[PDB]
Amino acid sequence: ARVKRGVQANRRHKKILKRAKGYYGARSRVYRVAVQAVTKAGQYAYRDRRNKKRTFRRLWIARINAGARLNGLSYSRFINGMKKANITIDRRVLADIAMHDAATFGALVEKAKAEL
Amino acid sequence: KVKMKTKSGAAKRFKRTANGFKRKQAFKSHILTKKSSKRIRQLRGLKMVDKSDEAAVRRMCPYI
């Protein structure tokens, strides 16, 4: 029962090369270079999937810091004010209010400013 | 046909018992004047092969 591996090898190698499309040079053409580029891409994606949550919080905090400083206090005093006023609004929503509706954020800072 | 070979020299020193193997003790062939008579008395007779060592005896003597 001789088994020829050409057919299964072809679609196996093709599966890796299809996943390596858009890569430069040998990384999208030859399997030996493409297989470890696909693995490395998956490793970056797994780590960057944690770092994304880490990077957007930095973005929200900076946006909130700009908004609070435009009218009144800083971010460090803003978060303390929201915490003392029992305001649960997340930094994601706050940064969206600051960047897209400045009247509401002005009213939102006042509630934090009167609480300290 | 091809059978497993007994270690014919390990069969001359180990004997099958019910739950293990038995054997003589060493240090009893010669120079015996200097040994206390407790050694001459308690080195005389049978002991059991140790649990540690009876896997080797099973591999050496597969048919006993």
Binding site: - | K7, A10, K24, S29, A56
Partner: protein
């Protein structure tokens, strides 16, 4: 059976054999469970029954003892519970042979107290232990 399709081995009967060196996911890739560079990792490796790496092996630190007896290999011990295979009432050496209780080359036999007889027997030329003798005659047997 129903059909040659729905004939199954009865789960637990069959187990998949182990194939060494077939990739990371199989659990036996790249070494076959052999470990790293060493004598036991090499192609013709073996454990060598009777070897401790150089110290005189256990079977050579201890002395040889005893001798083999030729009588012991022609004397068979017979149990009371094996006597149900005998045809008739006589229990002799030739009668134990045709019952396939003892080997055809056994010269003499001994009946020991292992099980219990169910019918009267007549023993002619076989030695009977003290415990077996009282069990024989308790069932109506005799020894001659």
């Amino acid at each position: 059976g129903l059909r040659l399709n729905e004939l199954s081995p009865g789960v637990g009967a069959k187990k998949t054999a182990q194939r060494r060196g077939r990739g990371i996911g199989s659990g036996l890739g790249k070494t076959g469970g052999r470990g790293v560079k060493g004598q036991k990792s090499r192609s013709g490796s073996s454990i060598r029954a009777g070897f401790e790496g150089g110290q005189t092996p256990l079977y050579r630190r201890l002395p040889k003892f005893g001798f083999t007896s030729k009588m012991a290999m022609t004397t068979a011990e017979v149990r009371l519970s094996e006597l149900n295979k005998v045809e008739g009432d006589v229990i002799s050496v030739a009668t134990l042979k045709t019952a396939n209780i003892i080997r055809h080359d056994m010269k003499r036999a001994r009946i020991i107290l292992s099980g219990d007889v169910t019918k009267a027997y007549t023993f002619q030329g076989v030695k009977v232990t003290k415990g077996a003798k009282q069990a024989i005659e308790a069932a109506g047997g005799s020894i001659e």
